[PDB]
Write a protein that binds this ligand. Structure first.
Ligand SMILES: CCCCCCCCCCCCCCCC(=O)OC[C@H](COP(=O)(O)O)OC(=O)CCCCCCCCCCCCCCC
Ligand SMILES: CCCCCCCCCCCCCCCC(=O)OC[C@H](COP(=O)(O)O)OC(=O)CCCCCCCCCCCCCCC
Ligand SMILES: CCCCCCCCCCCCCCCC(=O)OC[C@H](COP(=O)(O)O)OC(=O)CCCCCCCCCCCCCCC
Ligand SMILES: CCCCCCCCCCCCCCCC(=O)OC[C@H](COP(=O)(O)O)OC(=O)CCCCCCCCCCCCCCC
Ligand SMILES: CCCCCCCCCCCCCCCC(=O)OC[C@H](COP(=O)(O)O)OC(=O)CCCCCCCCCCCCCCC
Ligand SMILES: CCCCCCCCCCCCCCCC(=O)OC[C@H](COP(=O)(O)O)OC(=O)CCCCCCCCCCCCCCC
Ligand SMILES: Nc1ncnc2c1ncn2[C@@H]1O[C@H](COP(=O)(O)OP(=O)(O)NP(=O)(O)O)[C@@H](O)[C@H]1O
Ligand SMILES: Nc1ncnc2c1ncn2[C@@H]1O[C@H](COP(=O)(O)OP(=O)(O)NP(=O)(O)O)[C@@H](O)[C@H]1O
Lengths: 258, 98, 262, 262, 258, 98
């Protein structure tokens, strides 16, 4: 029925409505609820390991490849303009103000934005997440608070590591394989950086959709209905949305500052 | 396999083995190839039936849709044993008039 | 006189009215096993009487006070009284067996890290999983993966404890050891235990005052005997095989004649 | 004389030696139920005697010929003989109930799309899920989600059929209707049925010649009676509660004295 | 033990070794095994819907955002060079030869590279994938062959749609919000395209790691061990690898052609 | 709560309620605060015990590790009823010498 079809559409409207409402409530309860008995900092260490460190080889190799691609594209894009040696101010400006954090999102939100949702989803599905209450610990502070903290304090560091490896790979292909001159590269690069105005720009950009990624990437895991199909669908909702939001907030955050 | 015969005057004879293989051919050669020509009062009697699965059940079933659609009335005689049981399971208690 | 009583309790999940002005009254010291049809809301009753799920209205008297009307600082202290054993164990995949069993102690009590080890060890011996004090539950065979959970429950020596479908889907050796333990804990430790199992046979075997929960209303209750001949059509259909009765066998079809013919 | 026999069968999953020169011989017309301890390899035996899993060496005589030595064009034709009912239904989430039940017909036979509908309808009536000929299995309550699978199995009228843990984890009403159907199919349709259930009680209740599979070797077999008093320690430990026996209760710990003391 | 630690490392070596070996065998069996009884083309239609169409809104919105970001970055990157009006030959060359297909991978491999693995994983886990054999149909041709075909014939179309929407959004922000002149944009764009040499380059680039994405994104789903934790880990392995391979083959495919 | 007393000459008196609260204090005030000063043959007798859980079991247990580590030998007397049962469950059959 078309009228009831639109009824279902509107029900989905109110559904995402109440969804992110409940999400912000969840986030509040998690970051500022109380202090639980069985918490600490070792939790944060274990998480930060599972979320950042394990997801580090991926972004290292990905930074390598995307950097040398950025080079092999800039060299050939610009040799048609003579200003070949200026490739440094490209491979280090695009890889540092916009593409750096965007790809770092789409990868972090790819792996650690998912195997983080499936983790606390599975937890909810084997009731493990529930027996915590019957014990007495608040899960939203023992199970998910270290997730959020491993998010906020990993993805920015990951973006930095990615940008570094990207620039270095771009140089290594440009210097050794393209043949452009050694010192000229870093020279034009440092002459065209504007630290507080591009580097810090990219870092605040990284942090904001670090927060946004590992916010949904954990909420979805907390909300998914407990069944092996439910989790299998939540760990896809949290890639759809974690990429949508990465790019959307990249766009807004770059309209705030060109 | 099995076969169909003896039309236009009731007494629909049914041969031995009604399986998934021999199914459709019998359906088509009975439903229109025979039930278009009948007079009335179709006695379908399963005398010389060797062995049949639910496919035969659904066959004698389709034998009834057309006859009802053909206006004329029909009934079954000499229902075999295995058919009797395959009807017993999925009730078909009276829907198989004998 | 009673360990747990549920006065005027009702619950609705999205106004679905899961529980509807119910009254259950558990006797202490006696293994009572509640159960009911599919989707009848048992586990909901568990998380209720364990105060993980906030009731809509009513009160849950538990060894004295009622829970939904307690202060967090006191509710947490009450948590020391009741243990819960889910099916599928519900172990923390993060921590090994030993830390997993110790967890409730490391939460509600401040003991010398040796003494915690000794309590954990004696409990694990009581349940038999004393050897695998190093395995991670990921490494642990799905059977004992439940007995370790039981040991974690009986830690702190709670006076009552809940069982969410304990004997469901395991070889009768594991089912046998588990049904021996859930009864040993009651015969010795004198702790109220609330089995919650779809399995009628073993439940009615061991239980003392079984209930039957259906569509938001307790569908009667009794000791196994009175329940075996209640003659209430709904119940007598449940507690026996008798597939056709108040709960229909067939789905609401239209007609076995017309639909197949027209 | 026998529906299915397993001569000299062995199987190894990664050289683990799941099955190890076994000999099982199923009689036709009689519901036999094989079972065994946890991880004992039953479902493996199913997928073997249903020719989803290629045996290492041995032969599986099935209503005549043996399968692993058949041509694909003939193996496919043999597939018309044996049905399989998993637990959790194993319905295709893509197709609705009706198409789901019709699937085997739409595969092995070319029937007028009406006639397929009539066979599907009579089967669904036989199992009772005749009404929900439109629901998608996603919409279907987990109980009937198995009876529809059973109807799909009995489609084509296979002469033997397998049951992978049928009566495991459902309210005794659904378990009752299912145990009535799996027996009605055998008493009427005279089709060999192979229950495979950890649940000892109902299995031994309905079964005729039960087996016991353990660590790659059939741990004996018999009708329920002879099996109830075999006095073989392994078996008599299995078929009864008796938690402590050949299968140990405790884990291989070191010492209940030293470890807790030193 | 360190020696046994290296033993485990080497075992993982042989493991990924035999893994992708078995993967290529699987792929062969799937695309060229036989012709099954219960197959057809309606299967391909249903799949192609579930894989392409549902994953189309994501890449539409993502193309929009990434295009306007590419613009808002090019305008400001290049106004410092005077050649402002040349933004068209940027927002339409980077979004069409390298970044277009790369982001289309990281998104398609994000959503339809995962909710495709979880799908045929769940199938394997509820044994649904196995009863097909007991019926007689070969799953590798009824269940996964339409997956592969919905992969190969969707991701390239998706890359094209993405590049189109990206260029159009870049124009819409450049024209209406940046104010650069209407005709000049498309003019410099078409004067600097080299169709058979950039557009077709991007399309073959899209196709190759369409094949590569929806190859692992279905193999992993076929191999994952049947348990709600197994699938939850496979649908992360198939994002790690599906992004690794996207970028790696992008790099190789752009070294084949600058 | 409960308490400890009567050291240096055996006859370790134990007071009423040994729970998780009164546990650690008794442990520390007995293990070193008392067992460093004892002569030998430590008779720990649970006469005036009100009510104790496994924490008390593990306490009298720790009472043995130190004594064994302190060379001197010890034993228990007048084992209460609930303790008797909590030992009965997790065998502790002989490991509680009386
Ligand atoms: C009068 C107020 C009362 C209610 C108003 C709520 C409407 C606002 C929310 C819109 C979301 C509707 C989508 C529902 C469709 C659906 O099927 O749902 C689509 C999905 C969920 O679909 P499923 O539940 O079927 O999987 O939801 C989403 O896509 C959520 C993302 C939407 C964006 C959220 C933030 C909005 C950003 C700002 C808007 C940009 C517009 C630019 C204007 C300048
Ligand atoms: C001629 C030289 C060309 C050599 C080609 C090899 C390059 C391709 C290597 C593949 C990348 C591996 C990452 C896969 C993700 C993963 O492992 O997934 C991450 C896993 C996850 O671990 P878990 O098992 O605990 O989940 O971590 C690992 O165990 C892997 C650790 C090391 C893997 C290699 C990564 C660093 C080395 C990269 C080499 C780059 C060379 C630099 C060029 C100058
Ligand atoms: C993924 C692919 C990467 C993109 C490469 C494709 C081709 C490059 C872009 C086309 C523009 C160059 C044509 C003009 C010729 C010219 O005179 O260009 C060369 C001129 C010559 O002046 P100089 O000698 O002073 O450098 O210099 C410049 O234009 C400065 C810009 C160089 C690039 C620096 C990085 C800013 C670019 C945007 C970063 C983020 C965008 C990337 C993702 C959206
Ligand atoms: C050209 C104009 C562009 C238009 C701009 C509009 C889009 C803006 C960006 C889109 C955001 C993506 C929406 C994803 C949410 C969703 O899909 O909503 C759907 C999901 C849940 O929906 P379901 O559970 O029903 O599927 O939402 C969530 O998971 C809950 C949290 C949503 C995250 C919101 C992020 C807000 C960003 C705040 C940044 C400020 C913080 C900085 C502090 C330091
Ligand atoms: C101003 C009010 C508008 C608010 C935003 C409207 C949200 C409407 C979302 C519906 C979109 C299609 C959903 C179809 C459902 C489906 O099949 O697919 C739904 C998909 C996922 O499919 P599933 O149902 O299988 O989960 O969900 C989505 O990802 C939808 C993403 C919506 C994102 C909206 C962001 C706003 C766009 C910003 C553009 C800025 C331009 C402005 C320039 C001036
Ligand atoms: C015109 C040219 C034609 C090109 C032909 C395309 C060939 C594509 C072959 C790619 C193989 C895909 C793997 C399939 C998925 C799978 O099953 O593979 C899955 C297995 C993992 O199996 P398990 O994790 O389950 O054990 O292996 C992998 O994870 C593969 C990882 C893919 C990484 C790609 C990296 C390539 C780039 C390397 C370059 C090094 C650069 C160094 C220079 C300094
Ligand atoms: N969070 C929830 N949101 C919506 N519905 C729920 C939720 N939790 C449970 N339900 C439904 O409400 C009922 C409660 O589930 P459950 O506790 O398993 O029922 P039960 O009768 O106690 N045990 P069972 O028969 O196995 O379902 C079921 O019908 C669930 O589908
Ligand atoms: N593909 C596989 N790869 C590796 N191990 C497997 C595989 N399939 C099964 N196994 C293992 O081999 C055994 C076979 O599983 P299963 O068929 O369930 O055993 P079963 O004795 O027949 N039934 P159950 O006791 O419930 O496990 C189990 O121990 C599994 O862990």
């Amino acid at each position: 029925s078309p009228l009831e079809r639109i009824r279902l559409f509107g029900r989905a409207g109110l559904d995402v409505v109440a969804a992110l409402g409940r999400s912000t409530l969840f986030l509040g309860h998690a970051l500022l609820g109380r202090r639980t008995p069985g918490t600490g900092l070792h939790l944060l260490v274990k998480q930060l390991y599972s979320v950042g460190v394990l997801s580090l080889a991926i972004i290292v190799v990905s930074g390598l490849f995307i950097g040398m691609v950025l080079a092999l594209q800039g060299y050939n894009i610009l040799i048609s303009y003579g200003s070949e040696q200026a490739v440094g101010q490209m491979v280090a400006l695009t890889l540092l103000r916009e593409l750096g954090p965007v790809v770092t999102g789409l990868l972090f939100a790819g792996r650690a934005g998912s195997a983080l949702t499936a983790e606390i989803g599975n937890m909810k599905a084997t009731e493990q997440l529930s027996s915590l209450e019957m014990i007495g610990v608040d899960p939203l502070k023992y199970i998910v608070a270290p997730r959020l903290w491993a998010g906020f304090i990993s993805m920015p560091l990951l973006a930095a590591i990615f940008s570094v490896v990207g620039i270095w790979g771009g140089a290594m292909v440009a210097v050794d394989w393209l043949g452009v001159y050694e010192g000229s590269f870093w020279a034009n690069m440092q002459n065209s950086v504007q630290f507080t105005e591009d580097v810090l720009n990219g870092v605040i950009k990284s942090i904001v959709f670090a927060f946004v990624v590992t916010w949904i990437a954990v909420y979805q895991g907390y909300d998914c209905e407990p069944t092996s199909e439910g989790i299998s669908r939540a760990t896809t909702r949290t890639v759809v949305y974690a990429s949508l939001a990465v790019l959307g907030l990249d766009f807004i955050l770059t309209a705030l500052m060109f | 396999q099995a076969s169909l015969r003896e039309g236009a005057a009731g007494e629909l004879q049914l041969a031995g083995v009604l399986d998934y293989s021999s199914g459709p051919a019998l359906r088509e050669q009975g439903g229109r190839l025979i039930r278009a020509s009948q007079a009335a009062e179709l006695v379908v009697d399963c005398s010389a039936v060797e062995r049949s699965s639910s496919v035969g059940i659904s066959l004698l079933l389709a034998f009834i849709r057309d006859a009802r659609k053909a206006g004329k009335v029909l009934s079954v005689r000499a229902l075999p044993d295995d058919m009797r049981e395959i009807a017993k399971v999925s009730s078909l208690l009276e829907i198989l008039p004998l | 006189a009673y360990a747990v009583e549920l006065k005027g309790l009702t619950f609705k999940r999205g106004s679905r009215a899961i529980f509807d002005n119910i009254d259950v009254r558990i006797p202490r010291g006696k293994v009572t096993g509640i159960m009911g049809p599919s989707g009848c809301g048992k586990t909901t009753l568990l998380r209720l009487i364990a105060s993980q799920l906030r009731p809509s209205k009513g009160e849950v008297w538990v060894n004295g006070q009622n829970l939904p009307q307690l202060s967090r600082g006191d509710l947490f202290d009450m948590r020391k009284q009741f243990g819960v054993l889910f099916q599928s164990g519900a172990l923390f995949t993060d921590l090994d067996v030993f830390e997993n069993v110790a967890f409730p102690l490391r939460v509600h009590t401040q003991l010398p890290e040796e003494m915690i080890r000794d309590i954990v060890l004696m409990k694990l011996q009581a349940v038999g999983l004393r050897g695998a004090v190093e395995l991670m539950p990921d490494e642990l065979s799905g059977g004992m993966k439940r007995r370790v959970a039981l040991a974690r429950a009986i830690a702190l020596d709670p006076q009552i404890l809940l069982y969410d479908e304990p004997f469901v889907g395991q070889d009768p050796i594991a089912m046998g050891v588990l049904v021996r333990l859930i009864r040993l804990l009651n015969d010795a430790l004198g702790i109220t235990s609330i089995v919650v199992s779809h399995d009628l046979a073993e439940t009615a075997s061991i239980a003392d005052y079984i209930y039957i929960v259906g569509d938001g209303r307790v569908l009667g209750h009794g000791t196994p005997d009175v329940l075996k001949e209640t003659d209430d059509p709904r119940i007598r259909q449940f507690v026996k095989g008798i597939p056709d009765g108040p709960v229909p066998f067939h789905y609401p079809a239209r007609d076995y004649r017309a639909d197949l013919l027209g």
